[PDB]
Symmetry: D2
Subunit: 344 residues, 4 copies
Amino acid sequence: GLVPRGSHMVVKVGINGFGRIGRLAFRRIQNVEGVEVTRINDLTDPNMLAHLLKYDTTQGRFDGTVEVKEGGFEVNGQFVKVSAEREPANIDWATDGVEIVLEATGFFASKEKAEQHIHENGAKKVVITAPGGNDVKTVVFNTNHDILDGTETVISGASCTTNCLAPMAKALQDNFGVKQGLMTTIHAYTGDQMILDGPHRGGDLRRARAGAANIVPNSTGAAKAIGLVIPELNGKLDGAAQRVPVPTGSVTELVATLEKDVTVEEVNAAMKAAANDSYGYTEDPIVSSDIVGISYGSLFDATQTKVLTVDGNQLVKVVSWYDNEMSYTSQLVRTLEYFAKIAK
Amino acid sequence: VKVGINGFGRIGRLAFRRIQNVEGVEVTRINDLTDPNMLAHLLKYDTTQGRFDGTVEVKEGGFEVNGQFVKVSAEREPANIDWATDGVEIVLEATGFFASKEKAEQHIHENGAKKVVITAPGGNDVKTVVFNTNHDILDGTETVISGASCTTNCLAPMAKALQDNFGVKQGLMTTIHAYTGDQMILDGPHRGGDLRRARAGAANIVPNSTGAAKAIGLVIPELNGKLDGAAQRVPVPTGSVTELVATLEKDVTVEEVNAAMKAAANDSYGYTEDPIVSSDIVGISYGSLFDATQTKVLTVDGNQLVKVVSWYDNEMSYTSQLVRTLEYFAKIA
Amino acid sequence: VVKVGINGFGRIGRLAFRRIQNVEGVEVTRINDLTDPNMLAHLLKYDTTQGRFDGTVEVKEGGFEVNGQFVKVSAEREPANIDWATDGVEIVLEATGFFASKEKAEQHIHENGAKKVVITAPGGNDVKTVVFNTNHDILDGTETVISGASCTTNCLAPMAKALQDNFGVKQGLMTTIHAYTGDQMILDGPHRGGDLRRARAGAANIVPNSTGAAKAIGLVIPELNGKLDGAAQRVPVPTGSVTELVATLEKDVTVEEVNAAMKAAANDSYGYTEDPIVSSDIVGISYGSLFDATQTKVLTVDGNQLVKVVSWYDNEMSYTSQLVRTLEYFAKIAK
Amino acid sequence: VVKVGINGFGRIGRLAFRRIQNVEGVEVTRINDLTDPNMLAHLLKYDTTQGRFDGTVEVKEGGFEVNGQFVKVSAEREPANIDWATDGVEIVLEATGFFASKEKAEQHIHENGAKKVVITAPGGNDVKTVVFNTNHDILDGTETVISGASCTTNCLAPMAKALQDNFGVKQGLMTTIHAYTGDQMILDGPHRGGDLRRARAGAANIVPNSTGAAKAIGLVIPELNGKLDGAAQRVPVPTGSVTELVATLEKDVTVEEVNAAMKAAANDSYGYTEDPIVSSDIVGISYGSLFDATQTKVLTVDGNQLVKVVSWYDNEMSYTSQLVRTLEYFAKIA
Ligand SMILES: NC(=O)c1ccc[n+]([C@@H]2O[C@H](COP(=O)([O-])OP(=O)(O)OC[C@H]3O[C@@H](n4cnc5c(N)ncnc54)[C@H](O)[C@@H]3O)[C@@H](O)[C@H]2O)c1
Ligand SMILES: NC(=O)c1ccc[n+]([C@@H]2O[C@H](COP(=O)([O-])OP(=O)(O)OC[C@H]3O[C@@H](n4cnc5c(N)ncnc54)[C@H](O)[C@@H]3O)[C@@H](O)[C@H]2O)c1
Ligand SMILES: NC(=O)c1ccc[n+]([C@@H]2O[C@H](COP(=O)([O-])OP(=O)(O)OC[C@H]3O[C@@H](n4cnc5c(N)ncnc54)[C@H](O)[C@@H]3O)[C@@H](O)[C@H]2O)c1
Ligand SMILES: NC(=O)c1ccc[n+]([C@@H]2O[C@H](COP(=O)([O-])OP(=O)(O)OC[C@H]3O[C@@H](n4cnc5c(N)ncnc54)[C@H](O)[C@@H]3O)[C@@H](O)[C@H]2O)c1
Ligand SMILES: [Mg+2]
Ligand SMILES: [Mg+2]
Ligand SMILES: [Mg+2]
Ligand SMILES: [Mg+2]
């Protein structure tokens, strides 16, 4: 019943917030037939945004030409309009043919705030590049993108850590059954931390601290909110993060109790059988720099698996890598592409 | 004398720390953009400068430091700060947003402060003081003064020593500098339009401009227009070094240059012959620490290029100089 | 005064020396490494993570003076060839990382050598492994070689013992998010221990690696023998670490009850905090382990509970403080 | 099709191997280091600063296969004991850092050994020292041991040559703000070379240190012999560096005139940019030197000028690109 458009039917997309996720989403969209970005909105001039697209500390030089123009810039000869409108309600997305908006500022990550993009001369639909609350459909591609029918006005692409955790947790559930579990993500520092110790605008006394000079504990909702993606794991997981001095690249550990008894070999085999474009599998003893720029949402590491058996009881440890930037962005663009095709 | 701090940031908090050991000054009011709990926590725990030497306890509308209450406000406009309510005569303007005569003067009003010390360059019409180099230019009648920049407090005594001993014709400066709070933690839009400070500060060598060499005339009049320079910002969270390459009026040796610096040494200008690194100068009380191991004198066909190098903790070196100037200014006010 | 020797004037060796300056009745009279006195004196004076030395250090022939007092330096590669007795040394801190076994550490004990040795690391299952204020009562003074355990063991031990004593532990898994150390390469290159992860640039990566602390916990807390396992994620801070333990318990608990149990167990070795601190805040501390109540979790699902407890440690100074406490105690009961 | 050996499969050795995959007429048939094939294969596949290897690498007995082609690995500590000729090797890239002189590099040349050696570092004053596209014309092909110079020399040389040719150089001082390297300690500890600054934690400090690039420039540009000196400030980036030169010239100049001269000197080795870039932007580039027009200064005081010129270089890939250019040329004329 979905009657998806062909990739020859080009859907025009807008990006609100040309930041880490916005710029990398723009990069990946260059290699997607059927989606193209015609409007970028941020809080700055075209020259700043053009320069940040061209040159990228962790993700390398842009694959193509970028040239600044009046009110925008050209990417491989094709003009992209830039505006500097602080309020989503005041962005005229329809002027540039934009139907779907990537909401990637971090400031409008709810149904009510994201819907500000939807108005007369605005957009039709919004994909929030973050958790969007419990009343918004939350999609990890290749785990639950089949929940979309195309009539939705606002959807969520989840978080980076959710896209890492989801396929790993789903594999445990489907093969062995999960009773409960606790997650720790050892995570790259991100733009919501201070470069040096100073007052954090969100009131967080740990994100106030120098992000590239500390191990910084911090909260995450990924394990607690996993029910939005995998309903059968609702309320079964919790977790937190340890943010550390790498500029991108992260890893998720899950310690769980299962319904079935297992061996390390059986756990690793289950993950390998679950592998696809989104969920990767490796037995190489890699480190974080090796996963920067990958296209897997999640990369299971069979070298870190543990099964501890004591007096008939087992604790199981599973670990998956993710580039919080590109792994997430790859999933986001897979979801955007699919959503664009079935959109109604 | 009772002091106020506008901007309880890196310089503001370290200025508060040093003021705890200065008899003549005490802080009775802090103004920023946040609640007391945030500021108290940031005072207690410091990534580069260590745990606070004392007790800090959050109260309603402020916090107690070793039992003594300090009022906290969150007033965005200097004009709206009621400094006189807490007896404040002099304000340390340390936000980075009001570093000019006109903007700093907003602190001075009915129920406000009397005087302001800007913790940064403040323009050509504000007296710019490096303690132990030119603090004798103050008479105490000034409303707004400047404590200069971190790099100016490093450069000044070293350049002055070259001038007094050998005469300076011209020179170029490179400061290899710690990343600071005006850089982005990761690549993103820089609100000051700077395409290099837009970049991830702890993951790059980042070229950037500085006014210290160009504006040296404000501190050392005889060097006016003789120097220029720039910075290379690098991934350390504090601690910096200033290299000056200069032509001199007199011929010199490495040993004569080093001896001149040693003779110029005092509480502000230090001397070392130990092959140290940047972590070794974190938290020092010298404004400038000359390093004799890095001195060069290149003689080619009778002509000399002379290289002199001095360390500074852009945080604690500058803050020590700032508080010396504040103390002296408060006494003669 | 018990006279002590240090073999390996490295991170632990130099910080042990620093702490010994504030212990009356122990002094270092001999240092042995693989370099000249000028190199060692400079590394004592200046310290990237632990700050400038609190005192004067001046190089002399065959050693250096610390606050006017001479300390002899030698460059002897073989422990058997060190004449410790010449300088009155009875006990040696073996801190090279190369002689961490009973047979290798015993080489210090010979004619004109030392009497006893404290290995600054795990030393095998036939050497008594001591975490101060957890199990230092196992020492009688007649031992020749003992172990101060690892940094992670000194962090984990009092936290795990507190869980056991109050609630009973069935099993648990440990992750330590750990500062990079000197056994990692500064940039990608061949690792002489054959480790393909320690081969990688240690200050530019999250690096998984193994640890024996949870597996070997039975050596310190016999009732937890075989009940724990774990691993490490080494990350780009030059010192400062944290240990997370996820465990199942024999009793049902709340977050408040777990935190109260840790506070009641607090002493000179095991600290307690409710401040939301980060790794830089624990650099240079004297606690072997600093419990962080802000990170505690108790997840209850269908009547079953998983418990998370987390403790900070400066792998350098926290361990060194525990090491010196054990050294001092061992020295004064020595027979 | 000339067969090459690599002694020291390190940062320069592994990246040289990578570049050689895309050079027709040169191939590596032998690698020598101090470890097993599994360690070296892993280090080729995965690279912190330079990214994943573009190809398949599979470990075998006594070596590894790269895209199906076997490369022999040995663990011989002494250059004299390496049987290079067994695997057809004529030229050896000496990239260990331990045999960077004529006498020590010549140990590779014996019966059943190699014919020629290219030292991946300064090799002393009696070895021909080549920066490609600056002075590779000094080679005739009869040499047994040559040097590819240092990373800093390959950065400095084309920039200093352009100043000399256009304006004339009286004297100058160099500061290179340089990535930390494998000769520094990861944390504070005894430095085997006796250097009290390289003893310090390299990724947590600004570390002054010596360099020979400016002092030894005469080996590359004879007319600048004895005219320059310099030093380095090593800082916490794992690769990527920049060289500043402050100089007095024989002619008066403007900023525009200096930049135009550099642009006119640009080629495959010497790049030109006016973009305000940072160190991460030059990681993995193929220029030996990338002049940055945004950093140029000309200070005129009482008729006298000091001129500042600045060029970027990835001390790893920029140098390696130059090294492989010189190796390719040297192989063809041998
Ligand atoms: N960085 C990651 O690893 C990551 C991973 C997954 C999800 N996310 C999510 O993606 C979003 C963006 O994160 P990021 O790391 O790219 O942040 P960022 O700070 O790099 O990007 C935010 C951008 O939004 C712009 N912006 C802010 N307010 C705006 C406004 N009112 N109107 C227009 N533009 C505005 C900023 O100028 C900036 O360019 C957040 O919701 C974040 O949680 C980030
Ligand atoms: N950090 C250094 O190395 C250094 C050295 C010398 C001079 N300085 C100068 O000192 C000043 C502060 O630098 P910093 O590094 O401490 O900055 P910072 O960002 O650490 O501190 C700035 C503080 O000002 C507060 N603030 C901002 N706007 C405000 C307003 N309108 N009202 C009240 N408070 C406000 C912020 O909340 C923050 O706490 C600048 O002028 C800087 O150039 C800094
Ligand atoms: N660094 C930590 O966080 C930490 C914590 C707890 C335990 N440890 C343990 O302490 C030991 C030392 O660790 P470190 O970090 O201080 O290492 P390090 O590399 O800093 O110190 C080792 C020292 O031993 C010297 N040395 C090497 N071989 C020698 C020999 N044959 N004779 C004499 N001296 C020799 C080296 O020159 C160096 O000074 C190891 O067993 C380590 O596992 C380290
Ligand atoms: N890394 C740079 O930025 C750079 C730039 C230009 C030139 N260089 C020069 O290149 C050379 C190597 O530097 P690097 O950074 O690649 O060093 P590295 O330490 O990364 O590589 C050295 C390699 O040589 C091996 N080795 C050591 N002794 C050996 C022996 N006796 N026999 C065989 N193999 C041995 C080591 O195992 C290691 O793999 C040095 O001469 C250096 O000065 C380095
Ligand atoms: Mg497209
Ligand atoms: Mg006081
Ligand atoms: Mg003592
Ligand atoms: Mg080839």
